Structure 1
Amino acid sequence: RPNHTIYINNLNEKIKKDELKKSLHAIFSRFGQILDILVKRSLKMRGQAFVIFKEVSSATNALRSMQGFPFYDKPMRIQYAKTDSDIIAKMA
């Protein structure tokens, strides 16, 4: 089920938080405007990220194009987030 937020994993856990945020942005921006990028590095949130897109269409094109895309020597696995981000919920 499509969503404003794409959930990304199989990411490289050795990339610092800010750098990962930046690059994630820098190549997910082409698909539309990015509300936020929530990244981290704790134990269960390790190696993974949420890119929050302003409208859904942008998240679908993103997932479609860069599924399996190898990123910092690892192939990104992209699904839709199961839940709306607090940002998006908060707008409504």
Structure 2
Amino acid sequence: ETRPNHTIYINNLNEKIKKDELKKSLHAIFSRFGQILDILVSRSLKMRGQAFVIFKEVSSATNALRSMQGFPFYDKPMRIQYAKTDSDIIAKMK
């Protein structure tokens, strides 16, 4: 939401983009900010235009957040929040 999460929630994503290449482009732009646990993207009716990237450390998520906030990606301005709830791996990876 607005409380620092390992995982950022991105939206206003250009839905015209194919799935894997939407990752590929996302994973590159963001891996700069730190180790990246995974990137989830569905093009379903209600999951499209949105991506979850999960970082190892919280600080990576935080830095990725404000730095990239509101920038144009594929001709559309990203909106970034902290994700409302922790991504699954965070537990599973224990």
Total equivalences in the alignment:
92
Q: CA deviation at 1:40?
A: 1.9
Distance of 1:25 and 1:54 partners within structure 2: 14
Q: Over residues 4-55 of structure 1, what are the superposed CA-to-partner deviations in whole Å (9 max), with x where a residue is unaligned?
A: 0000000000100000000000100100000000012000001110000011
Task: Give the Cα–Cα distance (whole angstroms) in 2 for the partners of residues 16 and 37 of structure 1.
Answer: 14
User: Using the alignment, how far apart are the partners of 2:86 and 2:93 within structure 1?
Assistant: 11
Instruction: Measure how far apart 1:63 and its partner are.
Output: 0.3
Identity of aligned residues (%): 98
Q: CA deviation at 1:64?
A: 1.0
- Pairwise CA RMSD: 0.7
Quick check: 1:9 aligned with 2:11? yes
Unaligned runs of 5+ in 2: none
Quote how far apart the aligned CAs of 1:89 are.
2.1
Distance in 2 (alpha carbons) for counterparts of 1:11 and 1:40: 12
Distance apart, 1:79 and its partner CA: 0.2
